[PDB]
Design a protein around this ligand. Structure first.
Ligand SMILES: NC(=O)c1ccc[n+]([C@@H]2O[C@H](COP(=O)([O-])OP(=O)(O)OC[C@H]3O[C@@H](n4cnc5c(N)ncnc54)[C@H](OP(=O)(O)O)[C@@H]3O)[C@@H](O)[C@H]2O)c1
Ligand SMILES: NC(=O)c1ccc[n+]([C@@H]2O[C@H](COP(=O)([O-])OP(=O)(O)OC[C@H]3O[C@@H](n4cnc5c(N)ncnc54)[C@H](OP(=O)(O)O)[C@@H]3O)[C@@H](O)[C@H]2O)c1
Ligand SMILES: NC(=O)c1ccc[n+]([C@@H]2O[C@H](COP(=O)([O-])OP(=O)(O)OC[C@H]3O[C@@H](n4cnc5c(N)ncnc54)[C@H](OP(=O)(O)O)[C@@H]3O)[C@@H](O)[C@H]2O)c1
Ligand SMILES: NC(=O)c1ccc[n+]([C@@H]2O[C@H](COP(=O)([O-])OP(=O)(O)OC[C@H]3O[C@@H](n4cnc5c(N)ncnc54)[C@H](OP(=O)(O)O)[C@@H]3O)[C@@H](O)[C@H]2O)c1
Ligand SMILES: Nc1nc(N)c2c(n1)[nH]c1ccc(O)cc12
Ligand SMILES: Nc1nc(N)c2c(n1)[nH]c1ccc(O)cc12
Ligand SMILES: Nc1nc(N)c2c(n1)[nH]c1ccc(O)cc12
Ligand SMILES: Nc1nc(N)c2c(n1)[nH]c1ccc(O)cc12
Lengths: 249, 249, 239, 249
């Protein structure tokens, strides 16, 4: 009852998994939210519960925008209170990412890219605050939102909307002692299936070490922002990009 | 011979001033409106009295829905039907009201605030580009996006998403010769519902003249960005705020 | 009658295009120069042939030193002595060269880069404001200030300082009806041209000058503390 | 062997807090000071009583002059003379006073405000890099540089120049494995000269707790940036402002 509890969206794999593991290692009980990756979510929960019993549960939800998304987001937050009796930390990590050229239906693309990257964060933030000591929300942003990838307008719109949520929610929730911050990766984990020749093109752009961030390096910034060492920090977005965003064309 | 412009939410206030000033510059205009049919028709009558066959109205709800892409395609189609071309799109229409995080359905609020401020601009941008010189798009942004109104999360999210669209569409549409820029008012025409005491509180905050922007002052920056004097400007957002965004708390 | 403008570094390139376009708009102009006397006088001769006694030149070193305040007071005073008024100040003069962090003295580089790009604009702003119907200052900024050229630390510091001055001066001078804004060129090598999204159009000094003309016009009377990027979209392009 | 840090302006207030927290983390420290000799020596004595031979003082004026490069080289050299290495540089020393545009010589004000806030950090960064594992530089910026205090032009110019240095130095020193970041306080320790009524005016503006940052809160963000938990972070500026910069006029 004395261990704090965290919800991490899109926690089965990659960066969300690293966040969930590092929160667990810091002493949090975790809700591992997932959409399609059930086997991976359950494997992570079983690993964490082997390390300390009754410290991890999974929660499935589609975070695409729809008439039912508010209820789904309320139920993710409720899953943390039902398992652990509290919810101290929300990490909005789940995200759709694919091109939408201006030149799936376009409204499905809107629902997926704006829903996962912005509306679901907003509704999870409402539900988190309504249900409420070091409370905080961390949003996974994008260091490159001002130099965006060609043909990613909806993704980019969603990530800019998430900056606006981070700022608006930081201002409105400060009186409740809820801090709201972001972590903005540059290039972190690349797709397994991406050719090494294409991965290397991206790695060579990064000033600091000519490599992508590990998931753990992203998670380290999340751990800092939820810690007692960040008690005066709200409305801040920490770039974890190895200097990538400083590199001109 | 005369270029043509679409102005969304053009029946009243800033959109009306933009439509008038484009018309005075030589443009044929589509006056888009949602509810303000009498004002839209009155404006078209006034512009047509000055030069015949230079203004038409087009009704559309720009709330997000599965038919919003068709409504946006229809607005651009209405410009081609009336005038045989579409040179300028001004994304001005916008919903604005509070959406507190702590306590219309929330999904209707998402649809209205994110639809009008961000998704409709995106879909109008797609339709504008697909249907294609001095081609340009001007998005009406908000100079106060980083110092937002308490309890305006969804509005602020939509205006941040509009910044993202302005940048992403500038990058992607540059090869087609379409420039995409923004105009960011601070306090301009104050809400019709606001009491006089509250209006004077906001006026006194503005360094340059202790007054709100006129609609015509906002329209002047739109006129610059669509002109031949801006043909190397794309992805830029011009604040028209009298210095308000420079004022600390 | 006619308003008057000071343009620093006005003998060549962007300053010259700004001076010509202000003159064409109906301003009388002070053409400031440091080393380019022949070019400054050639420009003044071209403008005075169009309208008599509407252009003068003014020599000043804008390197920071013990005398830079007096030099900046003289540039503003030159406008008031020639024309009886000073409505517009365009801070265009700039030094540009690399200053690597790892291996002219470095303090000479500070005096040139920080002096010309930031301190002279500050002192000219003070002198302009102290001597005071559509009054404004336009600072020539840099669209790539947040994605800087490798080994250009002092240049980049000076251009960031000039953003700070634009904002601080906009705030402090708004009560005097003086607007303060910036224009931020991108590129004004074929390598650089190929990266520009609007690169089908040639970058020109006239395009920068067009943004300056907008900002000093009545069409910008509510605009202060704004920096207009004129970069063809270059600052949007990722590495 | 213990790493070593230089902290400028470290005799009192935030610089002392940074020196203390670096010492508690296991660094040997150079306590730079200008006028505060008694406070600097009293701090070095306290740190040396905790662990012998872990703190020294170094006096220097960081006003700009033709000698400033030699002074900055000497500060870095004092860390190597004492400790055999120099792992961290914290640029904290800063002059802060108004310089009204409309009415010390102005050139003295330039030398002090631009010297301490920008040129000395630049020259110390050059000396730090030239003299060269987890190497990093942390610059103390200002969260309110875009909403500045009235009549502080030179101070604001100096802090904007420091942001430029942070980004330029991050790009250029990344290949040498030197990270360069910033910490941007909003309101922390209020000026000693300020009356309680004026201090309370500022405190009431801060969303998160209606109070200024403690010196330790600022030092916490510095400790994070120099730590292994920030190995991929360079060119980032962490606001530590309690949401103050999000508050509109
Ligand atoms: N990787 C990078 O280089 C990078 C760069 C910049 C920003 N970021 C940001 O960092 C965060 C993590 O990145 P990442 O690469 O680890 O993410 P990712 O692998 O692309 O996606 C994370 C998870 O999001 C969940 N998700 C996707 N669509 C969803 C939906 N409709 N409903 C619910 N959940 C859904 C998925 O869960 P299931 O697998 O369970 O279906 C997926 O595993 C994201 O916010 C991303 O934008 C990453
Ligand atoms: N006024 C300011 O101080 C200020 C400040 C910052 C930014 N801005 C921006 O500048 C632009 C103009 O501002 P304004 O105050 O003139 O705007 P406004 O009066 O609030 O709204 C403009 C028009 O938007 C239309 N609109 C609202 N909901 C809509 C929907 N669901 N579908 C279609 N149209 C809809 C309305 O058309 P009908 O009347 O026909 O229904 C309305 O007349 C907006 O983008 C605004 O965000 C304004
Ligand atoms: N060119 C670009 O692509 C570009 C890009 C970004 C920003 N900008 C900005 O746009 C503005 C104009 O650019 P530009 O390329 O036309 O500038 P420029 O040719 O490099 O220099 C303009 C003038 O500055 C004056 N100047 C230089 N050092 C001086 C000193 N110590 N004292 C007095 N005057 C001095 C010179 O006048 P004299 O010849 O009389 O000695 C010079 O002709 C600058 O502020 C620049 O930073 C330009
Ligand atoms: N306090 C805040 O609320 C706040 C807000 C925003 C940003 N910051 C930034 O955070 C840092 C620490 O702030 P603070 O309030 O603790 O600073 P501070 O007390 O105003 O100044 C720190 C030290 O700077 C040194 N300094 C001043 N002029 C100098 C010179 N000419 N040569 C060498 N050193 C000089 C002084 O050393 P001596 O005492 O030995 O003479 C002084 O103790 C500063 O960079 C500041 O700009 C602070
Ligand atoms: N959800 C999600 N997944 C990703 N793989 C990226 C992403 N968001 N943003 C990215 C930006 C750059 C990149 O290389 C990858 C990503
Ligand atoms: N559609 C729309 N209408 C408004 N009246 C404002 C708006 N957007 N943004 C505003 C920001 C400030 C303000 O005083 C008013 C507004
Ligand atoms: N005074 C001055 N002169 C220049 N040529 C540039 C400059 N400032 N900034 C530049 C940025 C890019 C570039 O290609 C050129 C410049
Ligand atoms: N060197 C220095 N000392 C200070 N006391 C402040 C400062 N810089 N910046 C500040 C910004 C706000 C404030 O209340 C105080 C300060």
């Amino acid at each position: 009852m004395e261990a704090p509890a965290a919800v991490v969206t899109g926690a089965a794999k990659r960066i969300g998994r690293a966040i969930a593991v590092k929160l667990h290692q810091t002493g949090y009980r975790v809700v591992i939210h997932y959409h399609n990756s059930a086997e991976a979510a359950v494997s992570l929960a079983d690993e964490l519960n082997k390390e300390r019993s009754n410290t991890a549960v999974v929660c499935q939800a589609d975070l695409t925008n729809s008439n039912v998304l508010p209820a789904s987001c309320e139920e993710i937050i409720n899953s943390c209170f039902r398992a652990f009796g509290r919810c101290d930390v929300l990490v909005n990590n789940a995200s759709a990412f694919y091109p939408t050229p201006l030149v799936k239906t376009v409204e499905t693309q809107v629902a997926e890219l704006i829903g996962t990257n912005a509306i679901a964060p907003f509704l999870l933030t409402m539900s988190f605050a309504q249900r409420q000591s070091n409370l905080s929300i961390v949003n996974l942003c994008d260091a490159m939102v001002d130099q965006p990838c060609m043909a990613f307008s909806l993704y980019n719109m969603g990530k800019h909307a998430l900056v606006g949520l981070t700022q608006s929610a930081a201002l409105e929730l400060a009186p409740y002692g809820i801090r709201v911050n972001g972590v903005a990766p540059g290039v972190s984990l690349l797709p397994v299936a991406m050719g090494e020749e294409e991965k290397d093109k991206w790695r060579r752009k990064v000033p600091l070490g000519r490599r992508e961030a590990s998931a753990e390096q992203i998670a380290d910034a999340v751990i800092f922002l939820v810690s007692g060492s960040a008690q005066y920090i709200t409305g801040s977005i920490i770039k974890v990009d190895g200097g990538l965003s400083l590199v001109h064309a």
